[PDB]
Paper text:
Members of the solute carrier 17 (SLC17) family catalyze the coupled transport of anions driven by a proton electrochemical gradient ΔμH+ (= Δψ − 2.3× (RT/F) × ΔpH, where R is the gas constant, T is temperature, and F is Faraday’s constant), with contributions from both electrical potential Δψ and proton gradient ΔpH (pHo/pHi). The D-galactonate transporter (DgoT) gene lies within an operon devoted to the metabolism of D-galactonate, suggesting a role in transport of this acidic sugar. DgoT is composed of 12 TM helices and belongs to the MFS fold. Two 6-helix bundles (N- and C-terminal domains) are related by a pseudo 2-fold symmetry axis perpendicular to the membrane plane.
To determine the structure of DgoT, the wild type (WT) protein was crystallized at pH 5.35, in an inward-open conformation and crystal space group P21. Nonsubstrate gluconate improved the diffraction, and it as well as β-nonylglucoside (β-NG) were identified nonspecifically within the aqueous cavity of the structure. The structure was determined to a resolution of 2.9 × 3.8 × 3.8 Å by molecular replacement (MR) trials based on all available major facilitator superfamily (MFS) transporters in turn because the MFS typically each crystallize in different parts of the transport cycle. The asymmetric unit contains 2 almost identical, antiparallel monomers of DgoT, with 4 molecules of β-nonylglucoside (β-NG) between the 2 molecules of DgoT and a root-mean-square deviation (rmsd) of 0.57 Å between their congruent 392 Cα atoms. The structure contains residues 27 through 443, lacking a 6–amino acid unstructured cytoplasmic loop (residues 235–242) between transmembrane (TM) domains 6 and 7. Although the main cavity of the inwardly oriented structure is sealed to the outside, the N-terminal lobe of DgoT contains a tunnel that extends from the periplasmic surface near glutamate-180 (Glu180; TM5) to a membrane-embedded site at aspartate-46 (Asp46; TM1). Polar residues lining the entrance (Glu59, glutamine-179 [Gln179], Glu180), interior (threonine-172 [Thr172], Thr297), and exit (Asp46) have the potential to interact with H3O+ and could therefore facilitate H+ transport. On the other hand, residues phenylalanine-278 (Phe278), proline-279 (Pro279), and Thr297 reduce the tunnel diameter to 2.4 Å, about the diameter of a water molecule (2.75 Å), suggesting a dynamic mechanism to control access of H3O+ from the periplasm. Thus, Asp46 is most probably protonated (uncharged) in this structure. In the inward-facing conformation, TM4 is continuous, whereas TM10 has a kink.
Author numbering: 27 to 234, 243 to 443
The structure:
């Protein structure tokens, strides 16, 4: 029982990763207040992380390949942890963009190293449950830590939100460097436990032209719907990781302290949507259903749900705002599961490429919505932004139910 402890350390790093994404949403109001930047300029601050994140992913694969999984993880954690620690001492605007950008650099190869690690640390049948553990759990981490930082932000200056988050990361990097090592090079493991992995699957030792014809295939009536769909899934997720705290603070005039305890229900609602979707996956086909309709239904329904974010601007009651926000985020988590489906639509050759472009579509949804909300909220308040997301969600839903009636193989 040493195989899981690794998964526990990966889960912690996924949380620390997403805290350093949402840690800014906490201090958005104060940073904006102190530095006196405009809503639209703040939109560029939120986005700074997303730009390089998507760009520094195909270079992240290179660095990873030629540097390894262990060491590459330490450089990343330490890299962005230092970059996050100094987000607390930033002054002006340009200082923040660079730190957010740098954070996006070292945090971009986060997942690829995970997939390369769970591969060698767990068999095949335990892999789907392994990734679902730390991706589903990430929202639990944001649910309990987001009210904490806000409470720290309301007790201590917003800087300490970044000093804490950054300092912790600097410490976890050092922990990772010692404890972690491939299953083969992991003392305390069990002789039979390792054989289970090796015989079961995974590389316990470790992991060891372009024609424009593909472009025409990669861009398919079925695959565009997948891209526009993921673009919409990422649009909503990055709103909750950025503008959602300040939304309640400014638009609805909720006290940051109450808005800090109102944000732990939506992040938990996401944790359920993810799991409840993975359960409807097995469940449907189990009752004699095709696989395409089995995975399409959670995605389409969840995005049609997301349309409920629009309803929040028609009420000023916390519980009703907190209920509607929790239902939309549930739809996002319930419709989040795509790539494994997208892997079964691209040709056997382009499974690797589709990922990069497929995520780019997602990462593209995270670059747009912060600028859109920042620009919209600057001039017309936060009301015209929630209709955009409900729209996008409706386009992503229409884009999935019309453009993907069946699967290509
Ligand atoms: C004013 C901000 C300057 C940006 C600094 C962030 C990058 C740190 C540069 O050091 C190292 O350089 C190598 C290649 O140059 C990288 O492979 C490695 O990941 C990185 O750790
Ligand atoms: C650029 C920043 C990246 C943020 C990612 C937000 C969009 C999520 C991508 O969809 C993912 O599809 C997987 C298929 O298995 C699911 O398991 C997983 O739950 C889901 O998250
Ligand atoms: O699956 C996820 O959790 C992300 O959305 C991915 O799209 C990453 O951006 C990257 O592709 C890692 O594989």
């Amino acid at each position: 029982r040493r195989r899981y402890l690794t998964l526990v350390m990966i889960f912690i790093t996924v949380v620390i990763c997403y805290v350093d994404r949402a840690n800014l949403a906490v201090a958005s109001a104060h940073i904006q207040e102190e530095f006196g930047i405009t809503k639209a300029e703040m939109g560029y601050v939120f986005s700074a992380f997303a730009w390089l994140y998507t760009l520094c992913q195909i270079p992240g694969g290179w660095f990873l390949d030629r540097v390894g999984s262990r060491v590459t993880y330490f450089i990343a954690i330490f890299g962005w942890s230092v970059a996050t620690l100094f987000q607390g001492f930033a002054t002006g605007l340009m200082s923040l963009i660079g730190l957010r950008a740098i954070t996006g650099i070292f945090e971009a190869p986060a997942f690829p190293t995970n997939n390369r690690m769970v591969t060698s640390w767990f068999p095949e049948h335990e892999r789907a449950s392994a990734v679902g553990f730390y991706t589903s759990g990430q929202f639990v981490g944001l649910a309990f830590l987001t009210p904490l930082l806000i409470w720290i932000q309301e007790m201590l200056s917003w800087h300490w939100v970044f000093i804490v988050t950054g300092g912790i990361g600097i410490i976890w990097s050092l922990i990772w460097f010692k404890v972690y090592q491939p299953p083969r090079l992991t003392k305390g493991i069990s002789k039979a436990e390792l054989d289970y992995i090796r015989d079961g699957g995974g590389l316990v030792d470790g992991d060891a032209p372009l024609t424009a014809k593909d472009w025409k295939l990669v861009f398919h009536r079925k695959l565009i719907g997948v891209y526009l769909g993921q673009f919409a899934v990422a649009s909503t997720l990055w709103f909750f990781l950025t503008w959602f705290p300040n939304y309640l603070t400014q638009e609805k005039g909720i006290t940051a302290l109450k808005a800090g305890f109102m944000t732990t229900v939506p992040f938990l609602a996401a944790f359920v949507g993810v799991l409840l979707s993975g359960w409807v996956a097995d469940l449907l086909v189990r009752k004699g259903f095709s696989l395409g309709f089995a995975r399409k239904t959670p995605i389409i329904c969840g995005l049609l749900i997301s349309t409920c974010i629009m309803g929040a601007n028609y009420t000023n009651d916390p519980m009703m705002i907190m209920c509607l926000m929790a239902l939309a985020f549930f739809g996002n988590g319930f419709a989040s599961i795509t790539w494994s489906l997208v892997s079964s639509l691209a040709p056997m050759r382009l499974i690797g490429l589709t990922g990069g472009v497929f995520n780019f579509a997602g990462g593209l949804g995270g670059i747009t919505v912060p600028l859109v909300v920042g620009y919209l909220a600057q001039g017309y308040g936060f009301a015209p932004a929630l209709v955009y997301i409900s729209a996008v969600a409706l386009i992503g839903a229409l884009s999935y139910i019309l453009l993907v009636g069946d699967v290509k193989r």
